[model samples]
Target: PESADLRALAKHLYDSYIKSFPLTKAKARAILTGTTDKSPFVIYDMNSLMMGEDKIEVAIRIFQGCQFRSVEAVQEITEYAKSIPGFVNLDLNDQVTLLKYGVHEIIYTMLASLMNKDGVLISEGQGFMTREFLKSLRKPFGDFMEPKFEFAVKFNALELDDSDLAIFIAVIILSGDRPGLLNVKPIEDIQDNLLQALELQLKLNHPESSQLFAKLLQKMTDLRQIVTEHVQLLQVIKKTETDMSLHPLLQEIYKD
Candidate 1:
């Protein structure tokens, strides 16, 4: 079969890309052995975009340099090692990007698990998580096996289990819309596919955030309203759970 030679160029660029990534030969071996599916373009695009670089060129480079597939499995599995947020403004310190390799890995694991799902819709049965997790992440629960709780730590230190996987997905469902909560970085890589997974995770979760009050208090409160106005109005809105995959994304935002 005649084919374009883009793969050769992609490999060359990807060799350079890997220098910034947290890949190890052992981890590379693990990615090859673990998933039965693949998405090398998605993987390349996601990784490149996360680094804020050109994805196709990066993929060709990686293909030339090493071995992997171009499937959903490849896309989700290899992305586990890193989640850089930007290219042009790459953060020298972890302070700027607001991303951690560990938490990023947890999100990827959740996606890998999601990629294996049998359903596309959200369910009330999935909204079983506690509100404690709805708060901003200060202490990433130990039970959650993910990248360690520090910014830019070695990616292998914290480990995840099946139960942690369930919780991580549940959190995305319950509280994903809370800004600066789930998406520490934008979906520069594979925005459509990866975000679809995030949306899938959201179906299983929805947050009743207490923190919303603090973020909105100044605008909503006046002379007649001082302490409880925000929560009071928030409570006034009908609170119920239903399928998430059915409606448009903004509809949920408007409904809430």
Candidate 2:
């Protein structure tokens, strides 16, 4: 079978792209392993709870931070996708279409980059929403973030390193299976090749690995569920939470 030799070139590109990521291996390990109880990413103030109309603005700002980070990362990944060998050859609208539907899943996949067992970092790590803190918010706001945190906790338990995340996210970006693509076979071929390469890399990176590949694939299922819940949250925010403003970009992403 002829190919663009993406597996080799993508490995090189992945090496470069992974460095552009803000978090380092040590920092990510610290987050996942519970090495530090007090990161600046976490909000330590007990009074910052989401409550009355007075407190809603604070909730809005923090939630905005989280959504913005995910959206921003999605934009970055879109740029990175263009550099992948087979990706640039896809139909332009197909590229756009794949990214639009896949953004949240990619967001959740890459969330592992910023996640701890407890919650996510917002405001570039200046503000952290703890699981306990998020659970305390008023109905829709509280309910929206906790399920994502639940998924994050279990996904983090897989203990994948930075290299693993890079390839995993790339595989996600090239998905041919997104709802309305123009050319499925070529995209699926790219995906299959990437997956094969990622599986090989996983073995080399974690030679003791047994089910890491299977586990990573299963996490994708969990991510699909989490993102579905995320869209539901967006729906409720649009319908009921009149005081809370979704960011324009997020509004665009969720607009239906």
Candidate 3:
């Protein structure tokens, strides 16, 4: 019964975050464009876009849309983070630090729902943009998305359901490893509970997969590397590409 409360909390969080935002393709498009049209959803062909012939323009538009989605995703994740027990009790500065550092990891983890081996689901599930196309974009743009796809494909193999993700994401946000923590002990205590809850849930749900818990923990470490690479790519984009704009929240997080 030790994990009873934690299990209940995890299910509630999953419903609030993942189930509530059933972002179908049309809904996702509406979020992006602010309008609803009857046009059929289409898979984008990135191969048709030549490298130098307006590729940057296309890449910028796609990147901007992704930024928009990321902003929305961040807002939801922040709300989810706040709802985690013991989260709001942390020092205010510590809360901000945890969110800033942990948001990307959480986003990437949630993104597995919108991704598969061939490509990511853009406009929600409406647009199945190919991975090859993303890799074909110019330096930073190509560099930025490819790693996420790489991670996502492998991550999808874990078969983590919404309940598992709820606890896992909480563990990501409450981690004590992030720099500049004023209240490490309390945060670690919370993380410990969530970690155990996650392991318990995974064992019950994926009983045959004995390595599931350890693999997920290792994925956390891999996620950190991806975030670091993403930060560097964002810096490159910020420096070299003046025409594109990042969301204010994203700008703040990526600022030096």
Candidate 4:
């Protein structure tokens, strides 16, 4: 019954968000094509860009947008996690551990969920940074954006709707497999319920779905790979972009 309640609550949260604010792709043709009225600095026509303050500003803005979104997302997920039955019962330090390492995965998952094949959102919804333009940022900065785009565009093929994305993200948050969990069994049990809920929801929502659940699980694997690539990028940034540091929270998450 407790598990059932958790499942219902999860579904409720999913429904509330989906009905209120469905995640859609960046729709403005101007934004999608990097031709927004306010984003004159998107570098759409530049063939060769030199590393200068303007370029650095653009790169930092891109990073800041993602980091800002990620920080906010982590807070939202923290609230959701607390709303789950067993989550609050975990040791406070364990809760911190889960959030510290776990949120980045969810952040990127949401990013990939909303992202279309065009590219990831950037410059505060004013522009979409193409893969080619992202690569032009040169070594260190470009490293951060390109790999995420690669993962996101590929993950978009699954075509997960927001309802599906909600359960999937819940699955990510309830994970017990992270490195520093204080009590594994409880967390594992929660994850099991979430997974079952996800399966049942997928079956009920997508009747023709045969490979859909399995494909989503595989996407989880792909998310881990993307995070690994991001970790490596952070390492590169550590050496190269000393002036452009991560936010304190992001620094702790990526530093570990």
- Indicate which candidate wins on TM-score: 3
Per-candidate RMSD vs. true structure? 22.4, 4.4, 5.6, 4.9
Q: Please, what are the lDDT tens digits per residue for candidate 4 over residues 1-256?
A: 6757656856775864454332333332234545435352333424323322254376776667677877766667777667555778988878888787778787777676445565555434434455677676656776676666677777767666676777777778778888878788888887887888888777777888687888888887877877788887777776877787677877777756
lDDT of 2 by residue, 75-174 (tens): 6777767766677788888888777776788777666566666666654454456667777666777687767667777887877776677678778878
1-256, model 1: which lDDT tens digit per residue? Answer: 1122322322332343344323322333343334543212222123333442233233223222212221322333234223322322433333212222223233333333222111100111111111222122232221221221121122121233232233232222222223333343433332333333333332333234333223222211221122123223323322421221222321232332
Regions more than 4 Å wrong, model 2: 1-10, 30-41, 46-56
What are the runs in model 4 whose C-alpha is more than 4 Å off?
A: 1-7, 15-56, 123-126
TM-score for candidate 3, please give it: 0.84
Models ranked on TM-score: 3, 2, 4, 1
Regions more than 4 Å wrong, model 3:
19-21, 24-40, 46-56
lDDT of 3: 0.77
Per-residue lDDT of model 3, residues 1-256, tens digit only: 7778767866766666564455633343344343454232444464433432242277797888789999988887888887888899999999999999999898888776667676666554545567777887777787678888889879878877777877888889998988889979999999998887888888989999978999999999888898888888778887899777778889898753
TM-score of each: 0.19, 0.83, 0.84, 0.79
Candidate topping lDDT: 3
* Descending-lDDT candidate ranking: 3, 2, 4, 1
For every model shown, the clashing-pair count is: 27, 0, 0, 0
Please give the range of 10 consecutive residues that has the lowest summed lDDT in model 4. Answer: 44-53
